[PDB]
Amino acid sequence: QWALEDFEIGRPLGKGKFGNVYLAREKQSKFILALKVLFKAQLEKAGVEHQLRREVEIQSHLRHPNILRLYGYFHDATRVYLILEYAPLGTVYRELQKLSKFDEQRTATYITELANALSYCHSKRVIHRDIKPENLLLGSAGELKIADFGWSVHAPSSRRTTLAGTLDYLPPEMIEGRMHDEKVDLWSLGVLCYEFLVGKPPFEANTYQETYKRISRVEFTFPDFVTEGARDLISRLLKHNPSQRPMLREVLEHPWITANSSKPS
Ligand SMILES: Nc1ncnc2c1ncn2[C@@H]1O[C@H](COP(=O)(O)OP(=O)(O)O)[C@@H](O)[C@H]1O
Ligand SMILES: Cc1ccc2c(c1)CN[C@]1(C(C)C)C[C@@]2(O)N(C2CCC2)C1=O
Ligand SMILES: [Cl-]
Ligand SMILES: [Mg+2]
Ligand SMILES: [Mg+2]
């Protein structure tokens, strides 16, 4: 339906593994959006066609203020183009680089917005599986929006695709290649809450092999400035046994969250 000729392309918004994302304007409507570009040759050698179909199918059917919209796609001889909602305030990754650490109020507010979006996802038995700061975007009023559904699926699930990037956000069950479910996103939420308050994720290390060891043994410690309440919530999320991880409703009702968040559920 859409073709490249229908858009004026502007500045690069960011880069992905596959994914070179550009600002764009549809010529007839002047609608401003983002165009995620992927090279067919690369997708073909990686053999990830099935993941790309999921990304479009899942994200296009989702409707929630804290989830980035995907409006459709087109392709030509060499590329695939995903048509996305434009997020004008950048990534949470950038904001963390800018400030080093977030205060309690900013952290609790982001966690509420994340928990709200994940709650909507899990009600449809969708799991995201790639929650991390570079995949969290910011709207015009500074509100958090979950993006990048390339790894998402319907639960329960195994894993039929090789992990390439960082282990930092993955739970023990996913790393050890065991069966997994929705509780994976709750572990990642714990990792994020720690990284927001401290400046770095709790299992970070110099080698893949050693990060693997720290994750599977759940070895993490807190700096002195992390408060009693934040410690409580984080320790409840980072449980080795996934059934012991809280429901999202319990996250949204945690005393430390409700005391510090400027957003409702
Ligand atoms: N809709 C968007 N608005 C603004 N920036 C974006 C948007 N989508 C992606 N980006 C930027 O491009 C980067 C890569 O996009 P992403 O969809 O995560 O690609 P990949 O699947 O390769 O990780 C993001 O981390 C962000 O910096
Ligand atoms: C969202 C989306 C998922 C899958 C694919 C497209 C778009 C682009 N169309 C096809 C054509 C029809 C063969 C089908 C395809 O699998 N694909 C991939 C090869 C690498 C891109 C293509 O070229
Ligand atoms: Cl398709
Ligand atoms: Mg990404
Ligand atoms: Mg992707």
Residues 83 and 113 in one domain: no
Ligand 2 neighbour 149 (Cβ under 6 A)? no
In angstroms, the CA 141 to CA 33 distance is 17
CA pair distance 84, 35, nearest whole angstrom: 6
Residue 265 lies in a domain: no
Is residue 227 included in any domain, yes or no? yes
Q: String of b and e for 69-92 (b: at least 16 CB within 10 Å)? A: bbeebbeeeebbbbbbbbbebebb
Give the domain CATH number at 82.
3.30.200.20
Give the atom of ligand 2 at the shortest distance from the alpha carbon of 43.
Answer: 20
| Resolution, expressed in angstroms to one decimal | 2.0
Domain CATH code at residue 142: 1.10.510.10
Statement to judge: residues 211 and 246 lie in one domain: yes
Distance, in Å, from the CA atom of 236 to the CA atom of 229, rounded to the nearest integer, reads: 11
SS3 content of the chain, % helix, strand, coil (to 5): 40, 20, 40
62 and 97 part of one domain: no
How many domains, the chain? 2
Q: From ligand 5's centre to the CA of 5, what distance in Å?
A: 25
Residue 137 CA to residue 87 CA, distance in Å, equals 6
Nearest-CA residue for atom 27 of ligand 1:
14
Residue 132 structure tokens: 């991390």
Q: Which of 76, 130, 224, 232 is catalytic?
A: 130
- The CA distance from 212 to 167, in Å, is 7
Q: Are residues 212 and 149 in the same domain?
A: yes
Token pair, residue 150, equals 């390339």
Q: What count of Cα atoms within 13 Å lies in the side-chain half-sphere of residue 58?
A: 25
Ligand 2 test: best mutation among 35, 37, 38, 52, most atoms within 8 Å of CB?
52
Q: 201 and 84, same structural domain?
A: no
Q: Quick check: CB of 21 below 6 Å from ligand 1?
A: yes
- Give the number of other Cβ atoms within 10 Å of residue 67's Cβ: 21
User: Distance of CA 175 to CAs 57, 83, 208, 217, Å?
Assistant: 26, 32, 11, 12
DSSP of 21-68: EEEEEETTT--EEEEEEEEHHHHHHHT-HHHHHHHHHHHHH---TTB-
CA 127 and chain centroid, separation: 11
Say if residue 83 is in the same domain as residue 100.
no
52 and 123 fall within a common domain: no
Q: Which residues pair with residue 39 across a beta bridge?
A: 79
Burial class (CB in 10 A: 0-12, 13-18, 19+), 183: buried
CA 125 to chain centre: 16
Which parts of 157-206 fold into alpha helices (H)?
172-175, 183-198
Phi and psi for 73 in degrees, rounded to 5? Answer: -155, 165
Q: Is the CB of 139 under 6 A from ligand 1?
A: no
Residue 54: partners with Cβ closer than 8 Å, 6 or more residues away: 149, 150, 152, 153
Domain C-terminal end among 74, 90, 106: 90
Q: Coil, helix or strand for 168?
A: coil
This structure was determined by X-ray
36 lines ligand 1 (CB under 6 A): yes
User: What 3-state class would DSSP assign to 156?
Assistant: coil
Last residue of a domain, which of 38, 71, 90? 90
> Which residue puts its alpha carbon closest to atom 17 of ligand 2?
49
| Contacts with 44 (C-beta within 8 Å, 6 or more apart), sequence order | none
> Which pair of structure tokens corresponds to residue 169?
């956000």
Give residue 86's domain range: 1-90
For tokens 């997708």, the residue is 43
Q: Is residue 121 within 8 Å of residue 155, measured between CB atoms?
A: no
- 165/185 same-domain check: yes
List helix spans (H) across 89-182.
92-99, 104-123, 172-175
Q: Which amino acid is at 175?
A: I
- Ligand 2 binding pocket includes 75 (Cβ within 6 Å): yes
Q: Which of 90, 120, 140 is the last residue of a domain?
A: 90
In this structure, are strands 136-138 and 126-127 parallel, antiparallel, or unpaired?
unpaired
Pocket test for ligand 1, best of 36, 66, 130, 132 (most atoms within 8 A of CB): 36
Give yes or no: 185 in active site: no
Residue 83 sits in the same domain as residue 137: no
